[PDB]
Amino acid sequence: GIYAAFDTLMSTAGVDSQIAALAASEADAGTLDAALTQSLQEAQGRWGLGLHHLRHEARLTDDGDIEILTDGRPSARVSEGFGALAQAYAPMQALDERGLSQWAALGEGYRAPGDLPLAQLKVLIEHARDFETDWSAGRGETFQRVWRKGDTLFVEVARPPEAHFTVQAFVQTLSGAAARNAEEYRAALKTAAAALEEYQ
Amino acid sequence: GIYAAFDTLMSTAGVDSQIAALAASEADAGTLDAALTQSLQEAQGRWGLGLHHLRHEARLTDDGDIEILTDGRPSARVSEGFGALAQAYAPMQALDERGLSQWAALGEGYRAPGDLPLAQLKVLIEHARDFETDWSAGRGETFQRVWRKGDTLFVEVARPALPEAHFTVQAFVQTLSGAAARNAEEYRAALKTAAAALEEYQ
């Protein structure tokens, strides 16, 4: 029931969550919650809603539902459907003329230009702490940006009914030492763009 | 009195705190606490103790003393003298073979190499958020580093100066705030200011 409903929601993001199978295997609630949350976080990167600055979680409820949270606040219930979920996210969003998010991924603060020479962006990747670029138009009608939070570099390539959920972006991550390598950044952009083109 | 004692402590850092004068004007306790705290923060930049990552405050006590706080915890009282203050700070410090601090100013996290090329440092100043470099060698036996926390860029030039209780000017920190903190051409100018000032003290 509700597990299959979650899987259906995830499928709109191209996320093969397999929650129905996990529940069928008699997983405990903790294992399910962790899986629900990991899947929802992946889906947020795919849907292009522009809410990277919020923490996204999902959890089983006593009444056989799945609660969807942002920053720890109950925001929606899976049983209520796509329209209800889109309505919940809508007031949190800020979209530009292209359908791209106007929020920084890191929250309030400085964002670098999105069209820097690679020679300069390399310095940020290698030597900054957390940082972020604004969107820029890239190859093949796409748009791209990057941010680092802690030891994960997030490389986003995007190409944008209100209740409709679909793949609008792909986020490729580089973690640990990989998060500080500018040539691996170039590779991740190619990966994300190629994946996005496949979905669209 | 205790206000003159604090001024004496501040003088070892080349800080003309004028607390005795503020007290003489019968400023309120909150005003004194703010002035004491601002002065202590300036002194910390001059003494070269390497405690930029800690919050430094100074406040009147109810029994006529001035308490020095580090991260909110009482560390020493001004009435207890230089020896007690140095003993309080010593276990917080981590100094290299040169007498330069081994702590990052920003705390745990990535620090760029000290000898990062100037042109690349400029990119950090213009386009990063918080960032920090390790020490590099400068002219005349000095060493320098730079970091930005929020909207303040800090440029430190140091030349370690002696008894453990001794306080003296070992460094100078020039700051740039607001839009000035993101102007890459400011770095060389601030470096020159700090180096020139340090030379005058020593």
Curated annotation (Swiss-Prot), chain A:
<dbReference type="GO" id="GO:0003684">
    <property type="term" value="F:damaged DNA binding"/>
</dbReference>
<feature type="modified residue" description="Phosphothreonine">
    <location>
        <position position="133"/>
    </location>
</feature>
<protein>
    <recommendedName>
        <fullName>DNA repair protein PprA</fullName>
    </recommendedName>
</protein>
<keyword id="KW-0597">Phosphoprotein</keyword>
<dbReference type="GO" id="GO:0071465">
    <property type="term" value="P:cellular response to desiccation"/>
</dbReference>
<dbReference type="GO" id="GO:0006303">
    <property type="term" value="P:double-strand break repair via nonhomologous end joining"/>
</dbReference>
<keyword id="KW-0227">DNA damage</keyword>
<comment type="function">
    <text>dsDNA-binding protein that contributes to the ionizing radiation resistance of D.radiodurans. Plays a role in DNA repair and genome reconstitution, and is necessary for recovery from severe genomic fragmentation as a result of exposure to severe levels of ionizing radiation. In vitro, binds to double-stranded DNA carrying strand breaks and stimulates the DNA end-joining reaction catalyzed by DNA ligases. Thus, PprA plays a critical role in a non-homologous end-joining (NHEJ) pathway for the repair of radiation-induced DNA double-strands breaks.</text>
</comment>
<keyword id="KW-0234">DNA repair</keyword>
<dbReference type="GO" id="GO:0006281">
    <property type="term" value="P:DNA repair"/>
</dbReference>
<dbReference type="GO" id="GO:0003690">
    <property type="term" value="F:double-stranded DNA binding"/>
</dbReference>
<keyword id="KW-0238">DNA-binding</keyword>
<feature type="modified residue" description="Phosphothreonine">
    <location>
        <position position="61"/>
    </location>
</feature>
<feature type="modified residue" description="Phosphoserine">
    <location>
        <position position="101"/>
    </location>
</feature>
<keyword id="KW-0346">Stress response</keyword>
<dbReference type="GO" id="GO:0071480">
    <property type="term" value="P:cellular response to gamma radiation"/>
</dbReference>
